[PDB]
Write an enzyme that holds these catalytic residues in place. Structure first.
Site, PDB file in Angstrom:
ATOM      1  N   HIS A   1     -33.517  48.041 -38.663  1.00 48.24           N
ATOM      2  CA  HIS A   1     -34.674  47.229 -38.213  1.00 48.24           C
ATOM      3  C   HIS A   1     -34.143  46.050 -37.390  1.00 48.24           C
ATOM      4  O   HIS A   1     -34.961  45.293 -36.839  1.00 48.24           O
ATOM      5  CB  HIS A   1     -35.607  46.723 -39.319  1.00 48.24           C
ATOM      6  CG  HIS A   1     -35.142  45.545 -40.105  1.00 48.24           C
ATOM      7  ND1 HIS A   1     -34.556  45.647 -41.360  1.00 48.24           N
ATOM      8  CD2 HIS A   1     -35.206  44.221 -39.880  1.00 48.24           C
ATOM      9  CE1 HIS A   1     -34.308  44.433 -41.833  1.00 48.24           C
ATOM     10  NE2 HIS A   1     -34.700  43.545 -40.932  1.00 48.24           N
TER      11      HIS A   1
ATOM     12  N   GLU B   1     -16.702  33.893 -38.284  1.00 45.71           N
ATOM     13  CA  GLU B   1     -17.535  32.686 -38.334  1.00 45.71           C
ATOM     14  C   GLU B   1     -17.674  32.051 -39.665  1.00 45.71           C
ATOM     15  O   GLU B   1     -17.751  32.801 -40.674  1.00 45.71           O
ATOM     16  CB  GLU B   1     -18.947  33.105 -37.859  1.00 45.71           C
ATOM     17  CG  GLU B   1     -19.077  33.404 -36.340  1.00 45.71           C
ATOM     18  CD  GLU B   1     -19.160  32.093 -35.544  1.00 45.71           C
ATOM     19  OE1 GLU B   1     -18.854  31.027 -36.062  1.00 45.71           O
ATOM     20  OE2 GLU B   1     -19.590  32.156 -34.357  1.00 45.71           O
TER      21      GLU B   1
ATOM     22  N   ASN C   1     -19.255  28.297 -39.773  1.00 44.86           N
ATOM     23  CA  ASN C   1     -20.420  27.479 -39.293  1.00 44.86           C
ATOM     24  C   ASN C   1     -20.822  28.116 -37.973  1.00 44.86           C
ATOM     25  O   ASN C   1     -19.961  28.058 -37.054  1.00 44.86           O
ATOM     26  CB  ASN C   1     -20.081  26.002 -39.264  1.00 44.86           C
ATOM     27  CG  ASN C   1     -21.343  25.206 -38.888  1.00 44.86           C
ATOM     28  OD1 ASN C   1     -22.159  25.673 -38.073  1.00 44.86           O
ATOM     29  ND2 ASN C   1     -21.468  24.065 -39.512  1.00 44.86           N
TER      30      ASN C   1
ATOM     31  N   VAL D   1     -20.663  25.592 -34.721  1.00 42.10           N
ATOM     32  CA  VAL D   1     -19.455  24.834 -34.507  1.00 42.10           C
ATOM     33  C   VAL D   1     -18.304  25.763 -34.141  1.00 42.10           C
ATOM     34  O   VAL D   1     -18.191  26.785 -34.806  1.00 42.10           O
ATOM     35  CB  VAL D   1     -19.101  24.016 -35.762  1.00 42.10           C
ATOM     36  CG1 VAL D   1     -17.683  23.468 -35.680  1.00 42.10           C
ATOM     37  CG2 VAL D   1     -20.168  22.978 -35.968  1.00 42.10           C
TER      38      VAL D   1
ATOM     39  N   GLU E   1     -13.267  32.359 -34.386  1.00 41.80           N
ATOM     40  CA  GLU E   1     -14.215  33.382 -33.881  1.00 41.80           C
ATOM     41  C   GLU E   1     -13.706  34.392 -32.943  1.00 41.80           C
ATOM     42  O   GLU E   1     -12.736  34.168 -32.220  1.00 41.80           O
ATOM     43  CB  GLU E   1     -15.349  32.621 -33.154  1.00 41.80           C
ATOM     44  CG  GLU E   1     -15.932  31.473 -33.987  1.00 41.80           C
ATOM     45  CD  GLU E   1     -15.252  30.141 -33.992  1.00 41.80           C
ATOM     46  OE1 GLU E   1     -14.164  29.823 -33.551  1.00 41.80           O
ATOM     47  OE2 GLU E   1     -15.909  29.245 -34.571  1.00 41.80           O
TER      48      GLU E   1
ATOM     49  N   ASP F   1     -32.824  52.285 -43.611  1.00 41.51           N
ATOM     50  CA  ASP F   1     -32.630  51.066 -42.831  1.00 41.51           C
ATOM     51  C   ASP F   1     -31.136  50.738 -42.619  1.00 41.51           C
ATOM     52  O   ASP F   1     -30.615  49.747 -43.154  1.00 41.51           O
ATOM     53  CB  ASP F   1     -33.421  49.902 -43.491  1.00 41.51           C
ATOM     54  CG  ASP F   1     -33.568  48.728 -42.479  1.00 41.51           C
ATOM     55  OD1 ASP F   1     -33.360  48.965 -41.244  1.00 41.51           O
ATOM     56  OD2 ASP F   1     -33.848  47.667 -43.062  1.00 41.51           O
TER      57      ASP F   1
ATOM     58  N   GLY G   1     -33.322  36.719 -41.509  1.00 41.35           N
ATOM     59  CA  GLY G   1     -32.070  36.192 -40.854  1.00 41.35           C
ATOM     60  C   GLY G   1     -30.860  36.746 -41.624  1.00 41.35           C
ATOM     61  O   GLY G   1     -29.823  36.809 -40.985  1.00 41.35           O
TER      62      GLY G   1
ATOM     63  N   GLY H   1     -29.580  42.987 -42.463  1.00 37.76           N
ATOM     64  CA  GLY H   1     -28.418  43.724 -41.946  1.00 37.76           C
ATOM     65  C   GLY H   1     -27.072  43.329 -42.600  1.00 37.76           C
ATOM     66  O   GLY H   1     -26.063  44.049 -42.456  1.00 37.76           O
TER      67      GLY H   1
END
Ligand SMILES: [Ca+2]
Length: 222
Positions: free
Chosen positions: A40, A52, A54, A57, A62, A84, A174, A177
């Site tokens: 979805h 990651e 934060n 920032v 990263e 899903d 949020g 996944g």
């Protein structure tokens, strides 16, 4: 993540952020080239952000990699949010290091009562919990009986409930996944729920252990 705690930085090295100019869903690194997420959360192209802590920032840890392929489970049903799960092929392999490590696929389905870890950058509904900083939550897997009792007839074989019937602690929008890790394997994918952390409406997760043939077959032979 509602009612959680800030993860020790990099303690969930498999955790990724799906980005399309902003964070919109989580996912899990499964090897150097593939990410597991929720169907979805599908977008024909996405940027995967690894390493990651934060998300707002620059930390030096990263890795930002664009997708080459986004593969929704062939039996994904958006009506009922069944099956899903999705595969994301990275345009280039990720670099494994102290910040980034794959999470193992499950070699068995974990039973009800197993304590797991969920994490993500979704809503926290709290003034003191910064959704920008990866949040962690300990949640137990619920029985199929409790799950279906809560959402009568909406729970398929491809799903499992985890959390608290009392409400108060849950994954949220949020976080979708993102990973559900139990005993060091990827047991679930954040998928759906009615609201977040509401009494009687526990989180619903894609049941990774029934997709191992599709996952490995897709990663290997394509
Ligand atoms: Ca960062």
């Amino acid at each position: 993540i509602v009612g959680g705690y800030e993860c020790k930085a990099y303690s969930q090295a498999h955790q990724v952020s799906l980005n399309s100019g902003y964070h919109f869903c989580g996912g899990s690194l499964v090897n150097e080239n593939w990410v597991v997420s929720a169907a979805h959360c599908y977008k024909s192209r996405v940027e995967v952000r690894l390493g990651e802590h934060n998300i707002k920032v620059t930390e030096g840890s990263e890795q930002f990699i664009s997708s080459s392929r986004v593969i929704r489970h062939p039996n994904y049903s958006s009506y009922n949010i069944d099956n899903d799960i999705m595969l994301i092929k990275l345009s280039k392999p990720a670099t494994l290091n102290t910040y980034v490590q794959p999470v193992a696929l499950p070699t068995s389905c974990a039973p009800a009562g197993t304590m797991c870890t969920v994490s993500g950058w979704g809503n926290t509904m709290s003034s003191t919990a910064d959704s920008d900083k990866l949040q962690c939550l300990n949640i137990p897997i619920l029985s199929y009986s409790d799950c279906n009792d809560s959402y009568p007839g909406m729970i398929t074989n491809a799903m499992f409930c985890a959390g608290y019937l009392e409400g108060g602690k849950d994954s949220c929008q949020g976080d979708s996944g993102g990973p559900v890790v139990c005993n060091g394997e990827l047991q679930g994918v954040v998928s759906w729920g009615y609201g977040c952390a509401e009494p009687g409406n526990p989180g619903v997760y894609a049941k990774v252990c029934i997709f191992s043939d599709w996952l490995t077959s897709t990663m290997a032979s394509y």
